[PDB]
């Protein structure tokens, strides 16, 4: 599913991501924009052989199981395929664990490089929330 901008903001809020660990909704929408362009089915293969999955490009080295990432963990206790669903529940619950891991949203390098320090509120501007 490719979400609309405000549609995704609303879904993220419904699932308790708004201001989670102090990160406003615009931060999460911005991260999703640059990680996946709002496409739940986004996948990308990393140089280390791990893969990133879903709207927030969650990585199989630590967070989910895909059966093809040697020496990896599955800390969210989910198949990576769950992160591709039109229902963002699994991605949100896993993101909550990731952002609580110590480095906040810096875990998403694209958030650090493209969202951090910017006017992230623009991502939810106009949205009925």
Interacting residues toward Cl ion by CB under 5 A: 24, 26, 67, 69, 72, 110, 113, 121
Output the smallest distance, CB 110 to Cl ion, in A: 4
DSSP 40-104: TT-EEE-TTS-EEETTTTEETTTS-B-S-STT---TT-SBGGGGGSSS-HHHHHHHHHHHTSSSG
18 catalytic? Reply is: no
Q: Is 66 annotated as a binding residue?
A: no
Least Å distance, CB 3 to Cl ion, is 17
Exactly one of 52, 66, 87, 119 is catalytic; which is it?
A: 52
Catalytically annotated residues: 35, 52
């Amino acid at each position: 599913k490719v979400f609309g901008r405000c549609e995704l903001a609303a879904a993220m809020k419904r699932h308790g991501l708004d201001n989670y660990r102090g990160y406003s909704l615009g931060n999460w929408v911005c991260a999703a924009k640059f990680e996946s362009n709002f496409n739940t089915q986004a996948t990308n293969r990393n140089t280390d052989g791990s893969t990133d999955y879903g709207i927030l490009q969650i990585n199989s080295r630590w967070w989910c199981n895909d059966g093809r990432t040697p020496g990896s963990r599955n800390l969210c206790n989910i198949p990576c395929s769950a992160l591709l669903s039109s229902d963002i529940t699994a991605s949100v619950n896993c993101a909550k664990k990731i952002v609580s891991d110590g480095n906040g949203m810096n875990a998403w390098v694209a958030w650090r490089n493209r969202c951090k320090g910017t006017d992230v509120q623009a991502w939810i501007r106009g949205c009925r929330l």
